[PDB]
Design a protein around this ligand. Structure first.
Ligand SMILES: *[C@H](CC(=O)N1CC[C@H](OC(=O)N2CCC(Nc3cc(C)nc4c(C(C)C)cnn34)CC2)C1)CN(C)C
Length: 289
């Protein structure tokens, strides 16, 4: 499983990881190796493989083989054609309501599954939702994921920005909300230049929160008193969205994290049972190469 795979294209440098297209020199499937190059620890990177092998799901990335002795450790995976991030930036593609319903659907079934199995994918962003031949979306980058201030600032839920130590599933949900806005607007919704500014963005956009809207807000370790903004109505931001969708977004971007709509609460919502339903993955937009 070391020399086994022959290197094709580069796919991504990373956080402490590189990713390569390679060809299994036996199966002849294209595969995506995650190199986790290291030194101290492979504690977090072993835990990853662990958490991974423990999951079977069509919207969860498929752990095929890990291997390798040296400075590095390799996780083999099914190759994927694009990520939801490129799918955004590709202008070629204009997005349809039923395209997004479809992208959201598969994301949240992935999520439902995960949180049933008591896990957090603490790093949900749109380059981490991959898509195959047949428009089947999959979560990935599990290097940040514990079994019940970590995401990349734009998709960081507030509680975290306010240095919450003990935090729940409402973390993953904030992200999914950020990803939906980003899907709608086709640009990062709340692109802070700093943690401090990421909160400014959140509040000025969504309004600064009450102790009603969020009790136990001030008890957070890094809590700090921002200016009080009113917020912006969602149908201003999303002149797009119909009321079934607005309802959903607004619930995902609730401030109180036990009052934040769970994956299931969200999958059990009109939006999904309402027309237009999800495009078949096979009929979902594909980009240039
Ligand atoms: C057309 C080729 C095509 O459609 N391209 C345009 C957009 C595609 O480029 C991307 O951004 N891709 C392709 C590579 C894909 N691989 C990738 C990246 C990362 C970071 N992780 C992973 C995994 C994990 C499971 C490890 C798997 N695959 N990746 C990212 C998106 C290329 C071809 N003709 C014939 C139609």
């Amino acid at each position: 499983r070391a020399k086994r795979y022959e290197k094709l294209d580069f796919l991504g440098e990373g956080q402490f990881a590189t990713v390569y297209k390679a060809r299994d020199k036996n199966t002849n499937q294209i595969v995506a190796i995650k190199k986790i190059k290291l030194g101290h620890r492979n504690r977090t990177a072993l835990r990853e493989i662990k958490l991974l092998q423990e999951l079977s799901h069509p919207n969860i990335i498929g752990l095929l083989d890990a291997f390798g002795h040296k400075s590095n450790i390799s996780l083999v995976f099914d190759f994927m054609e694009t990520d939801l991030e490129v799918i955004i930036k590709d202008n070629s593609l204009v997005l349809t309501p039923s395209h997004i319903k479809a992208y959201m659907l598969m994301t949240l079934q992935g999520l439902e599954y995960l949180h049933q199995h008591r896990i957090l994918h603490r790093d949900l962003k749109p380059n981490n939702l991959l898509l195959d031949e047949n428009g089947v979306l999959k979560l990935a980058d599990f290097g940040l994921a514990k079994s019940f201030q970590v995401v990349t600032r734009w998709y960081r839920a507030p509680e975290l920005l306010f240095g919450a130590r003990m935090y729940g599933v409402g973390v993953d949900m904030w992200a999914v909300g950020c990803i939906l806005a980003e899907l709608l607007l086709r640009v990062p919704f709340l692109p802070g230049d700093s943690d401090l500014d990421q909160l400014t963005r959140i509040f000025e956009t969504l309004g600064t929160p009450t102790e009603e809207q969020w009790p136990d807000m001030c008890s957070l370790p890094d809590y700090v008193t921002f200016k009080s903004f009113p917020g912006i109505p969602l149908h201003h931001i999303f002149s797009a969205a119909g009321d079934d969708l607005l309802d959903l977004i607004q619930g995902l971007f609730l401030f109180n994290p036990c009052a934040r709509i769970t994956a299931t609460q969200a999958l059990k919502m009109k939006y999904f049972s309402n027309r237009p339903g999800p495009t078949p993955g096979c009929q979902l937009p594909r980009p240039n190469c």
